[PDB]
Amino acid sequence: DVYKTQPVELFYPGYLESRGYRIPALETTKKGTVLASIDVRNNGDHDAPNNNIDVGIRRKEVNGEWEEGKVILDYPGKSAAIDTSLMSATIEENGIEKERIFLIVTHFPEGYGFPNTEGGSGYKEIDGKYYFILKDAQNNEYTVREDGIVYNSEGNETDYVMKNDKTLIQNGEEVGNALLSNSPLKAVGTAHIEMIYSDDDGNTWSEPEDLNPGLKKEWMKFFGTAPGKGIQIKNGEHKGRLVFPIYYTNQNNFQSSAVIYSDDFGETWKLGESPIDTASVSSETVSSGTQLTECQVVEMPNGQLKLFMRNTGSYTRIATSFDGGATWHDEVPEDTSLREPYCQLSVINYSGKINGKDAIIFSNPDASSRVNGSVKVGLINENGTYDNGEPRYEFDWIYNKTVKPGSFAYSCLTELPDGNLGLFYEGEGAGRMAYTEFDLNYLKFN
Ligand SMILES: [Ca+2]
Ligand SMILES: [Ca+2]
């Protein structure tokens, strides 16, 4: 025989001056590089608000060692970038497959986070165009229009200008930053998803692009990355589509999972329905029942999508999409092999065949609390059809292996170029982020 490395800590308290670290994401690029991203939770392990949380990343190239970590996204003050998701994706450009590594994160202005998030996209739509909202101490609404020029609520121009990094300028002088809690004009205290990308195998990253405008619905309060990774669809009519799992709340503070997706390689995004959205329930107005929260997605051989969801029930809920993430079958069953103690989980597609079948790999804490981290192997079996004739895929969990007997919380899986598996996970102690590699045999023996 078995292969199983001694776990190494890629981030730990004090590293890069940060008190805390959480929320692993893990992706392998087409060059074979492993990318591990993390919340750099500088003021401690606690969620936003009141935490200067940045995006950090470590790289391990094929036949290489872990490069030291660096911060690749850093907002002013204690404005948080929290919960990352990575995605290696490709496009055919003039006969070569060009790789772009996508990363989305959730973003809050200073002072806000999940428990006190306000609602809305953060944007005002004026004649088809979306403009960043700014608020003053008296709760008046302002808009940032062309040239960054700020307009008050009468549609009139003010002496304020907001730069794209939210710096505020009044008559040539800087007067604050709209993400900061002492600024005279403030961005709406609500959740954004922001995206960066890398075209050089994860070494350098773009400036953040906000994905809220024309994507997040005004009734949504929380609207955030489901941490871990997304996937680019390989099979079917939606081949090439980028799919990032997310979740959000409504006015009732009810959490619903979903995916956002892009058919032009990141340029524009659409929101799929939640699995909560059925013929009788609407995720806009639902107020009771099982909440579906953090989630990860895998693809079936025909391009059918399977969304595995943290939820307030005892077991993992799995939803199926026949249209590439736009909607989900109204039956959302539990899988009773997958005890789910209300913790993030990871599920990935495996490139190789196992026992002559296509397979997926799953990890989460297999217990009634965040302990006993287990990695499971599921074989995809075709089994008849749904009411609408669609293929039925089901999962034979052939291996179930404890990789972390004690504490174990959020985790993320990735496949290594040689077919081995990597695992980035919380569980070795406050702010300690561990990475280990292993082969299939290790999962089978035990
Ligand atoms: Ca920062
Ligand atoms: Ca649960």
Author numbering: 358 to 803
Can you list sentences taken from the study reporting this PDB entry?
The genomes of most C. perfringens strains contain three separate genes encoding highly conserved GH33 CAZymes targeting sialic acid glycosidic linkages: the nonsecreted 43 kDa NanH, and the two secreted 77 kDa NanI and 129 kDa NanJ. Here, we present the structural and biochemical characterization of the GH33 catalytic domains of the three sialidases of C. perfringens and probe their substrate specificity. The catalytically active domains, which we refer to as NanHGH33, NanJGH33, and NanIGH33, displayed differential activity on various naturally occurring forms of sialic acid. We report the X-ray crystal structures of these domains in complex with relevant sialic acid variants revealing the molecular basis of how each catalytic domain accommodates different sialic acids.
The structures of NanHGH33 and NanJGH33 display the characteristic 6-bladed β-propeller fold seen in exo-acting sialidase GH33 domains. The structures of NanJGH33 and NanIGH33 were very similar with an RMSD of 1.1 Å and with both proteins containing the same β-sheet domain insertion within the catalytic domain (between residues 477–546 in NanJGH33 and 361–427 in NanIGH33). The inserted domain is not present in NanHGH33 and the RMSD of NanHGH33 with the other two structures is 1.7 Å. The inserted domain is not within the proximity of the catalytic site of the sialidases, and therefore likely does not directly impact the activity of the sialidase. The amino acid side chains forming the active site pockets of NanJGH33 and NanIGH33 were identical, though a notable position in a second shell of active site residues showed a tryptophan (W354 in NanIGH33) versus proline (P472 in NanJGH33) difference. In contrast, these loops are relatively minimal in NanIGH33 and NanJGH33, creating a somewhat shallow sialic acid binding site. This lack of a +1 binding site in either NanIGH33 or NanJGH33 supports a general absence of selectivity for α-2,3- or α-2,6- linkages. However, NanI is predicted to be fully secreted while NanJ has a cohesin module that participates in the formation of CAZyme complexes and an FN3 domain that is postulated to mediate attachment to the bacterial cell-surface.
